[PDB]
């Protein structure tokens, strides 16, 4: 298949070109719990649309059945949103850059009930990335890994061959950065163990988001509702 013939540099380049755009929120300086939740929901919904077309550009993804593509996205969507958030928040210590015009600190996260704990976990992850000096090329590899790995449950083999390819890519990026062999293995491990925390955050947030869907706090979009419904059964 195509994704397996790709070189490390090609993989990196394919992933860079596939990157979705940074979106703005429709926020205007006027901030209830419903105001902030509405902006974030509206934002996330629009991000979802771009994510789907991005997923289709991730090497090997399209080779999979429509059914498996759906399953991978249903499982990983919030993880992908979150790692996106932490990446762009890297250069803003103590703040989360949801959008260029929506930069928030933790005290503002307290505006929405139960949100600050997740807020804090995302900040600590961003801080982690900053201390590791996470590179753009490493970030695109990690995000693609999340898509393909999180729900991988014939088809699985192909998915595993691609994942190996992305691992090779990450190692290539590190060897190219001058890292020694021992340092490559260590950094790879570090980055991958962070995905465990990203999974944890998605699960915790999903829990809250469903608590809101039934509370009718804010009108979640149809697509969002279907994505949320997938984690209940």
């Amino acid at each position: 298949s195509l994704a397996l013939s790709l070189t490390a540099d090609q993989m990196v380049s394919a992933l860079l070109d596939a990157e979705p755009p940074i979106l703005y929120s429709e926020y205007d300086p006027t901030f209830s719990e419903a105001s902030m939740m509405g902006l974030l929901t509206n934002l996330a919904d629009r991000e979802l649309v771009h994510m789907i077309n991005w997923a289709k550009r991730v090497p090997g993804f399209v080779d999979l059945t429509l059914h498996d593509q759906v399953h991978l996205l249903e499982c990983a969507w919030l993880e992908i949103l979150m790692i996106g958030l932490v990446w762009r928040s890297m250069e803003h210590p103590g703040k989360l850059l949801f959008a260029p015009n929506l930069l928030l600190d933790r005290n503002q996260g307290k505006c929405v009930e139960g949100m600050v704990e997740i807020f804090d976990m995302l900040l600590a992850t961003s801080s982690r990335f900053r201390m590791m000096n996470l590179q753009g090329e490493e970030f695109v590899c990690l995000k693609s890994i999340i898509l393909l790995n999180s729900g991988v449950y014939e088809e699985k083999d192909h998915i595993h061959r691609v994942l190996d390819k992305i691992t090779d890519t990450l190692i290539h990026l590190m060897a190219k950065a001058g890292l020694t062999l021992q340092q490559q293995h260590q950094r790879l491990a570090q980055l991958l163990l962070i995905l465990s925390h990203i999974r944890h955050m998605s699960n915790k947030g999903m829990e809250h988001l469903y608590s809101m869907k039934c509370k009718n706090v804010v009108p979640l979009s149809d697509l969002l509702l279907e994505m949320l419904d997938a984690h209940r059964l």
Binding site: L66, V70, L73, E74
Partner: peptide, 9 residues
């Protein structure tokens, strides 16, 4: 499902 539709188009 909507997701299904979006994956196609």
């Amino acid at each position: 499902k909507i997701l299904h539709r979006l994956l196609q188009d």
